Amino acid sequence: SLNTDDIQGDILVGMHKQKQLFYFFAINDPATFKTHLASDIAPVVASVTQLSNVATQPLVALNIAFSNTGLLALGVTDNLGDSLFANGQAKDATSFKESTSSWVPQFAGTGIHGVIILASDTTDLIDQQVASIESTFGSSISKLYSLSASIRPGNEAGHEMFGFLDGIAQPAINGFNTPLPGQNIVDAGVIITGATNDPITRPSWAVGGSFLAFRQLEQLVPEFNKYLLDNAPAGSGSLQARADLLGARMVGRWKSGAPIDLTPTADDPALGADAQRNNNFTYSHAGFDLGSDQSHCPFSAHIRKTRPRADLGGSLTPPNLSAGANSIMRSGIPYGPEVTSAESASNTTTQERGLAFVAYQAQLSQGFHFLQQTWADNANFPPGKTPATVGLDPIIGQNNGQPRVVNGLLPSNSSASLSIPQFVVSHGGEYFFSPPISAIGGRLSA
Numbered sequence: 001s002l003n004t005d006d007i008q009g010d011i012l013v014g015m016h017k018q019k020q021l022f023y024f025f026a027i028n029d030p031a032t033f034k035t036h037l038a039s040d041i042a043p044v045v046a047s048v049t050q051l052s053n054v055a056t057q058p059l060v061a062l063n064i065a066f067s068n069t070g071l072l073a074l075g076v077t078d079n080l081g082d083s084l085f086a087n088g089q090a091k092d093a094t095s096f097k098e099s100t101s102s103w104v105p106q107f108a109g110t111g112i113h114g115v116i117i118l119a120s121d122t123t124d125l126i127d128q129q130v131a132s133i134e135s136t137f138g139s140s141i142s143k144l145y146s147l148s149a150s151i152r153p154g155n156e157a158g159h160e161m162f163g164f165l166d167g168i169a170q171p172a173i174n175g176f177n178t179p180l181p182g183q184n185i186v187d188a189g190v191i192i193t194g195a196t197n198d199p200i201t202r203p204s205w206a207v208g209g210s211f212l213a214f215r216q217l218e219q220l221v222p223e224f225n226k227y228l229l230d231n232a233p234a235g236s237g238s239l240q241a242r243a244d245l246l247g248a249r250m251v252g253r254w255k256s257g258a259p260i261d262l263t264p265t266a267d268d269p270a271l272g273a274d275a276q277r278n279n280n281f282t283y284s285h286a287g288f289d290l291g292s293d294q295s296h297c298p299f300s301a302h303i304r305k306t307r308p309r310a311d312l313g314g315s316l317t318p319p320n321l322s323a324g325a326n327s328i329m330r331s332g333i334p335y336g337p338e339v340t341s342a343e344s345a346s347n348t349t350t351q352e353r354g355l356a357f358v359a360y361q362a363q364l365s366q367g368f369h370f371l372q373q374t375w376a377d378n379a380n381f382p383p384g385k386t387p388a389t390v391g392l393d394p395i396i397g398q399n400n401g402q403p404r405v406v407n408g409l410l411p412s413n414s415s416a417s418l419s420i421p422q423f424v425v426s427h428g429g430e431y432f433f434s435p436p437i438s439a440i441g442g443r444l445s446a
C-alpha cells in the first residue's frame, strides 16, 4: 500500500491549519539552495502520517512543490511523464477559454520555480517561519509572489466565500481510506504518481508524489448574491428562499452541505452535517428518467459537472463508481477579507477574495484540466441528456469572458436558459509536482 511516511501531508489529508501561505519562489543559486533544501526544509516537511496523528501536529506544517522550470533549475531533467506539467499552466489557459489578461503577472510565465505551502493556526507563526526560511536560504532564493489564505470565521468555518460548505467530497483511495456512503473508490495511482495502477512511467524518485494544480480563483460574492435575488424563480416561497434555491441549484448542494439531489426544495442542515448521508447519492431516482429529470439536481450543477456519478454509467444505487480516473483530491482554502458592508450594499466587489484552489492528481490531463475543459466548459456534458444542451458549469464554466449559458437551473422548465456572467475570475496559477519527502533531501538536493 501507500507509504504515508513519505507522502506530503497536503496531498491526502490537508494541512489541518487555520491559516495558509502559498510562497512562490525562484531558485537563484542551485548549489546553495540544495544544501538548505536538504538540511533545513526536508527534515520539517509534514507527512500524511504526521498530519493524521492528532498528537503530532507541527506548529507550522510545511509542504513544498516544484514547477517544471524549478526542476530544471535544480538540474533535474528527468521526464515526469506529464506534458501539461512540462508546458506550465500559462500555456494551458487556452484550454480553459480564459485570457491571461486577468492573471497575476508572476503566474503568466514560467519564472516561478516552486511553491512552499506554510500552514499554521496564526499568521504570526507563518510569518516567523518565512523569516527563518529566507534567512537560511539567503539570496539563493527569491520570493516572486505569495498568497495568504484562511479558513473563514465563526460558523462559516469550512465554507467557501459564496457561503457553501466545502470539503465534503473526495475520492476514497482503495486500500487506504475506509469509504463513506456514496464516496467514489479509486486506485492510489489516480492521485499518487507511481502508485497502484498509475500507467505512466515516472522517475523513481518521484514515486509517492502528486501533481499540484494551483489556481487563484477570485469570487465575486456580492455580484453572485445579487444575481440570485434578481433571477430567483417565481414561487410561493419567500424571495430569500427562492434565491437560496437558485444558488443551491447552481452548486448542487445547499450551504449546509446537504446535497440538493436528496433534498431538492429546501436545505436540510442535519443532512448537510452528516458525513454518513451527505454524499450518499448517485443522481438516480426511482420513477424518474435519469436522462431528462432535472427536478432533483440540474445536469449543470457544479458537483454534477465535476463528478457525474450515474451520468457516466455504472450503479444507480450508491456507491456509484464511474469515472474514477478523473478524480481529484481537493485541498483548496479561501483567501481575502470577508465581504464588507460597502460591497454588500453596492453589490460590487472592490476587495479581492475567493478560493486558493488546490487539486492533486497523478495525471493533470485526467484531473483538474479534464474537469475544467471536457466537462465544466462543455455545453453537451454530461452526454445523452434531454434536452442535450446542459450548458456550462455556472460556478467554474468559462466562455472566453462571455456570459455562460446554463440550462436546467429552473425547476419549472428544464429547457429554460440563464445567461450568467462569470462569478469566478481566474487569476491563473501554475502546475507543480509535490515530490515524495525522500526526494526532497534525496535526488532534488543532489
Ligand code: HEM
Binding pocket: 160, 161, 162, 164, 165, 166, 167, 168, 169, 170, 217, 218, 219, 251, 253, 302, 303, 304, 306, 307, 328, 354, 355, 357, 368, 369, 371, 372, 376, 395, 396, 424
Ligand atoms: C472558486 C471556485 C470554486 C468554488 C466556489 C467551488 C465550490 C465547490 C463546492 C461548494 C463544492 C461542494 C462541496 C463538496 O462536495 O465537497 C465543490 C465540490 C467540488 N468541486 Fe468545486 N468549486 C470551485 C472550483 C472548482 C474547480 C476549478 C474544480 C475542478 C476543475 C472543482 C471541482 C470540484 C469537485 C470535483 C467537487 C466534488 C464533486 C463530487 O465529488 O461530487 N471545483 N466545489
Ligand SMILES: *[C@@H]1O[C@H](CO)[C@@H](O[C@@H]2O[C@H](CO)[C@@H](O[C@@H]3O[C@H](CO)[C@@H](O)[C@H](O)[C@@H]3O)[C@H](O)[C@H]2NC(C)=O)[C@H](O)[C@H]1NC(C)=O
Binding pocket: 181, 276, 277, 280, 317, 318
Ligand atoms: C444510502 O442510501 C441508500 C439508498 O440509496 C440507503 O439504502 C436504503 O435504506 C433504506 C432504509 O434503511 C431501505 O429501506 C428498505 O427498503 C426495502 C425495500 O426493498 C424494504 O423492504 C425495507 O423494509 C426498508 O424500508 C432501502 O431498501 C435501502 N435501499 C437500498 C438500495 O439499499 C442507505 O441506507 C443509505 N445509507 C446511509 C448510511 O444512510
Ligand SMILES: *[C@@H]1O[C@H](CO)[C@@H](O)[C@H](O)[C@H]1NC(C)=O
Binding pocket: 226, 229, 230, 345, 346, 347
Ligand atoms: C443591490 O441589488 C439588490 C437586488 O437587485 C438591489 O435591491 C439593491 O438596490 C442593489 N444595491 C444598489 C446600491 O443598487
Ligand SMILES: *[C@@H]1O[C@H](CO)[C@@H](O)[C@H](O)[C@H]1NC(C)=O
Binding pocket: 413, 414, 415, 416, 417
Ligand atoms: C421553457 O423554456 C423554453 C426555452 O426558453 C421556452 O421556449 C418554453 O416556452 C418554456 N416553457 C414554458 C412553459 O415556459
Ligand SMILES: C[As](C)(=O)[O-]
Binding pocket: 284, 285, 286
Ligand atoms: C434515491 As430515491 C429514494 O429518490 O430512488
